[PDB]
Design brief:
Chains A, B, C: This is Transmembrane protein gp41. Chains A, B, C: It is found in: Virion membrane; Host cell membrane; Host endosome membrane. Chains A, B, C: It is a single-pass type I membrane protein. The structure is a homotrimer. The first copy, chain A, is mainly α. Chain A has helices at about 1-40, 40-70. Chain A contains two helices and no strands. Chain A is elongated.
């Protein structure tokens, strides 16, 4: 199981890596939006997805914390 | 195995969470492109990667559906 | 184990799919930044996160290579 636990641990870790990646690109999308916005429904679509994506990140963060707990058991 | 199935199920779920996150940031990138585009090769690079990324999302969506089936077995 | 190895292999694969997705959206964020930039601290925040995100992609790429090796064992 030790080697078994190893792979799953690097999968769980890799998922955390990906999530932080996704969060970091969010910070960047927000900036590009700000930039664009310094220069209609477009603003509406932006908010609909921004909310959606902040929603999905939260869920993932939560699921990440549970997967790491079930792995530590 | 029940607890074993549990972790893998939250990993599979987390992967779905990440994919939808990635898709939602795509909707947002498309919008920022539109925004930018309301104001050369740049347009070419945009299309090359847009296609690439829609390609990768499709594959992932497919692989997500298979991982969820192999887990339900 | 064969079926056991199967799921984990599609999870590892799915993670690669997601990473390449994330990298492809990076190429696109860079382009939208360039676009925006053709037209203050904003430039600083851009670099801080760009670095951060290139950092996270590297780590993930490395972790992807290890997970695929531990799975091939």
């Amino acid at each position: 199981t030790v080697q078994a636990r190893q792979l799953l641990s690097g999968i769980v870790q890799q998922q955390n890596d990906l999530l932080r990646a996704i969060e970091a690109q969010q910070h960047l999308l927000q900036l590009t939006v700000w930039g664009i916005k310094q220069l209609m429904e477009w603003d509406r679509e932006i908010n609909n997805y921004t909310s959606l994506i902040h929603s999905l990140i939260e869920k993932s963060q939560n699921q990440q914390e549970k997967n790491e707990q079930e792995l530590l058991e």
